[PDB]
Amino acid sequence: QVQLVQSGAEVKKPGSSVKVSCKSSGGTSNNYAISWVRQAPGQGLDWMGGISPIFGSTAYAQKFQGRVTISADIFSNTAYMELNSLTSEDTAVYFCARHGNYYYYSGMDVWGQGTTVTVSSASTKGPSVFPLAPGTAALGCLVKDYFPEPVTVSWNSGALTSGVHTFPAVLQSSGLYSLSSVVTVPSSSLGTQTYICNVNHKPSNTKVDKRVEP
Amino acid sequence: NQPWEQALNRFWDYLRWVQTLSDQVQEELQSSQVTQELTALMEDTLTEAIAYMKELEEQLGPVAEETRLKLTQNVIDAITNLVNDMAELRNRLGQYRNEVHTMLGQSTEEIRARLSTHLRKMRKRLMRDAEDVQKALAVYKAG
Amino acid sequence: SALTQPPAVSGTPGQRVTISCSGSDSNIGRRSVNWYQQFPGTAPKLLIYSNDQRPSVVPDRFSGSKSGTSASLAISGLQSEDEAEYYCAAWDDSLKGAVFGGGTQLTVLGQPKAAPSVTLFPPSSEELQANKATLVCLISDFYPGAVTVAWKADSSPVKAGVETTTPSKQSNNKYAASSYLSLTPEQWKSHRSYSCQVTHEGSTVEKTVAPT
Numbered sequence: 110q111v112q113l114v115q116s117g118a119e120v121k122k123p124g125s126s127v128k129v130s131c132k133s134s135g136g137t138s139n140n141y142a143i144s145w146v147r148q149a150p151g152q153g154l155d156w157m158g159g160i161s162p163i164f165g166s167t168a169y170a171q172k173f174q175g176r177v178t179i180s181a182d183i184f185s186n187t188a189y190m191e192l193n194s195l196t197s198e199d200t201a202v203y204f205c206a207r208h209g210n211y212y213y214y215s216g217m218d219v220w221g222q223g224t225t226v227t228v229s230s231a232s233t234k235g236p237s238v239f240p241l242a243p244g245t246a247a248l249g250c251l252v253k254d255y256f257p258e259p260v261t262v263s264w265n266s267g268a269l270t271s272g273v274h275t276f277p278a279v280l281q282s283s284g285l286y287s288l289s290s291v292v293t294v295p296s297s298s299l300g301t302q303t304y305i306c307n308v309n310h311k312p313s314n315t316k317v318d319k320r321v322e323p
Numbered sequence: 324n325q326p327w328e329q330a331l332n333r334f335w336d337y338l339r340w341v342q343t344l345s346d347q348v349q350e351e352l353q354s355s356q357v358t359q360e361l362t363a364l365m366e367d368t369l370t371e372a373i374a375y376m377k378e379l380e381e382q383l384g385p386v387a388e389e390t391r392l393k394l395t396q397n398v399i400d401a402i403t404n405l406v407n408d409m410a411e412l413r414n415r416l417g418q419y420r421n422e423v424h425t426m427l428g429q430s431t432e433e434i435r436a437r438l439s440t441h442l443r444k445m446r447k448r449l450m451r452d453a454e455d456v457q458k459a460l461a462v463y464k465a466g
Numbered sequence: 467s468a469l470t471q472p473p474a475v476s477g478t479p480g481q482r483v484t485i486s487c488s489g490s491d492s493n494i495g496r497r498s499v500n501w502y503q504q505f506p507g508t509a510p511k512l513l514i515y516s517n518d519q520r521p522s523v524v525p526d527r528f529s530g531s532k533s534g535t536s537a538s539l540a541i542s543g544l545q546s547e548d549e550a551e552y553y554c555a556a557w558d559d560s561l562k563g564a565v566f567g568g569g570t571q572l573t574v575l576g577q578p579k580a581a582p583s584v585t586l587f588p589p590s591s592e593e594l595q596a597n598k599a600t601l602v603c604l605i606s607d608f609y610p611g612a613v614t615v616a617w618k619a620d621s622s623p624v625k626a627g628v629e630t631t632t633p634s635k636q637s638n639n640k641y642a643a644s645s646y647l648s649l650t651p652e653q654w655k656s657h658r659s660y661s662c663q664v665t666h667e668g669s670t671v672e673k674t675v676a677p678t
Contacts (some may be wrong), residue, residue, distance in 0.1 A: 249587070
């Protein structure tokens with residue numbers, strides 16, 4: 110039950126560097142080879158490099174050799190990948206994977222959860238919450254022009270969950286995100302039930318409670 | 324053959340000096356100096372050992388791929404067991420520093436004995452693991 | 467990206483399907499091929515190693531083979547749980563590094579088609595007080611996930627200020643998408659109406675909203 114656990118999500122500006130870590134819990138991975146594989150959103154897997162510290166072998170892919178630096182602390186059972194000169198083209202998910210032996214030929218059978226690295230020129234911006242007013246009716250609220258992901262949208266402080274549909278946010282051309290949360294309710298409750306949409310954006314520390322009225 | 328074992332002997336000498344529990348080692352245990360000095364000593368030991376193993380593999384004869392892979396894996400597993408015990412020793416020395424910091428400066432005269440018994444058992448198992456590392460290295464010089 | 471896979475592969479439940487992986491003399495000609503399976507939003511799982519070996523947890527429904535420059539994965543007894551992406555990987559000596567394939571999206575047929583449900587929201591009063599206008603078009607519960615969205619000003623197609631997502635699977639294994647049309651209040655008030663026109667499997671659903 111050895112598990113690879115990676116560091117949290119990263120939001121960087123173009124030109125900076127990122128350092129992702131990979132810790133072995135419940136056992137040691139020093140006798141194996143740890144490789145870093147990245148996946149752009151919607152694209153396939155891309156091998157960046159790897160390291161087996163006890164065998165003393167750090168190999169890099171030719172695309173990233175000038176930018177990536179892979180290292181390991183054996184006493185803390187941790188591997189590290191540092192990617193420099195970040196551009197928008199480097200937003201991806203970075204997995205660390207452990208091979209079956211001390212080298213990179215064998216298959217990668219133990220994987221970490223992945224680290225999301227988002228490189229963008231957009232600065233942190235709190236969301237704007239607007240009510241979308243209404244057999245059955247459809248009300249909701251629009252969360253507009255926020256960065257970065259994510260935002261959490263609840264209804265009636267979590268008490269209302271039946272009929273809720275929060276659409277995946279869209280990344281607009283300006284670099285900001287927007288999503289919508291729609292509740293399909295019986296048209297009778299419109300007369301009696303109060304509907305409040307609660308939006309929470311932790312990156313900007315923005316809490317909004319918008320009441321949606323006909 | 325000799326260089327990595329000489330580094331291991333320097334590591335043994337440092338381990339004896341730290342398990343003497345002198346007041347110098349008791350003031351250096353709180354400055355984290357002994358931790359990083361021990362770290363550098365065992366790092367040199369491991370680098371010498373893996374260099375010797377890599378040279379042995381470099382002069383491996385007409386070997387089958389799977390057998391060479393398995394022999395290298397044996398040596399690497401021995402070395403990584405040594406590394407595991409070493410890291411446990413290092414982390415527990417740091418924990419001893421931070422748990423004599425629990426009274427912020429002064430240490431009793433029996434927590435020293437408990438730490439000393441832990442260090443002695445650690446030294447014995449480290450000797451066993453290092454000597455089986457040397458045995459795996461000797462087995463590597465075959466085939 | 468030195469290995470080549472077909473991007474899409476389909477099959478009915480119970481059928482046996484295959485994923486091909488063609489390489490060169492430097493990646494598959496001399497090294498063994500591994501196969502990984504990846505579900506949406508999760509880490510890849512090792513499915514095949516050494517071209518024919520299965521991990522203990524991988525069922526025998528998955529098999530592998532390697533012939534010269536090519537490799538092949540075979541999924542028999544196809545189930546709905548197998549809808550995923552499959553990557554073949556190898557080591558290239560010419561590149562001196564690990565290489566993957568483009569990934570094959572294995573989809574399982576059998577789910578009936580569903581027309582999309584569309585909801586169109588005009589800009590709120592508060593957003594208009596903020597000198598902004600945003601028309602929101604929410605499309606949900608359609609299969610397969612391939613819709614085309616267009617926006618109209620009373621007759622005319624308008625493509626400026628349109629932000630449309632790509633369809634994503636829901637919990638009920640149908641798809642959803644969004645489209646946002648951004649307008650200044652003068653544009654929203656000058657035109658008579660605005661229309662969100664979705665097209666799915668050839669059939670068109672049109673919603674319209676007007677000022678007030």
